[PDB]
Amino acid sequence: GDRRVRLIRTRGGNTKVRLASDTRINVVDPETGKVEIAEIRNVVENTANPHFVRRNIITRGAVVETNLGNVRVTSRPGQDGVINGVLIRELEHHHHHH
């Protein structure tokens, strides 16, 4: 025996499917300039009765909640099979003494 090798064959991803079997968005960070894919927590910016007919539909100018914070939808959901947006500050979020 003794002679033990690496054995590793394959490593790396492939062509991904569109947003359907998964939920995420390409977030552009304006504070540092990093581009990272964040998870979409809420598809609505906590507004009251969207007068733009935004029935939970992801649209240009709409702000979604993510693990990085509030993200603004810049392009239509479908480009490259993914959504693209910018990280911003829309909603208020401080701690609550329960």
Swiss-Prot record:
Keyword Membrane: no
Keyword presence, Nucleotide-binding: no
Keywords: Ribonucleoprotein, Ribosomal protein
CC terms in the record's Gene Ontology section: ribonucleoprotein complex; ribosome
GO biological process: translation
GO function terms (MF aspect): structural constituent of ribosome
Subunit architecture: Part of the 30S ribosomal subunit.
Similarity comment: family membership: Belongs to the eukaryotic ribosomal protein eS8 family.
Record-given protein name: Small ribosomal subunit protein eS8
Gene (UniProt): rps8e
Whole-protein residues included: 38 to 127 of 127
